[PDB]
Structure 1
């Protein structure tokens, strides 16, 4: 509803980490994909969301 695409994806990982704190593998795995995807820029973040 509001906010940039980058702020959307950056904040989702923080919530993912908090919700899934018992299993730390999800946050580490999900950020690994984002690091490769996020180099392209805002277009890369859209690929991660898709």
Structure 2
């Protein structure tokens, strides 16, 4: 349903924004792994959570 997809997308962005604010929840070692392809740190963590 379009409602479920919209709800999931908005909630996911709120989590990512809060997680990466101030001191990030995820260490720099995991960011290096998730940014090997070329995607940014925020984007790499976002796909893994999904």
Q: Into which bin does the TM-score normalised by the smaller protein fall?
A: 0.3 to 0.5
Corresponding pairs, count: 50
> In structure 2, how many angstroms separate the alpha carbons of the residues matched to 1:6 and 1:37?
27
**Structure number with bigger Rg:** 2
Where in structure 2 are there 5+ consecutive unaligned residues?
none
Higher relative contact order (CA 8 A, sep 6+): 1
Task: Give the structure-2-normalised TM-score.
Answer: 0.37
Per residue, is there more helix in 1 or in 2?
1
Task: Give the structure-1-normalised TM-score.
Answer: 0.37
Where in structure 1 are there 5+ consecutive unaligned residues?
none
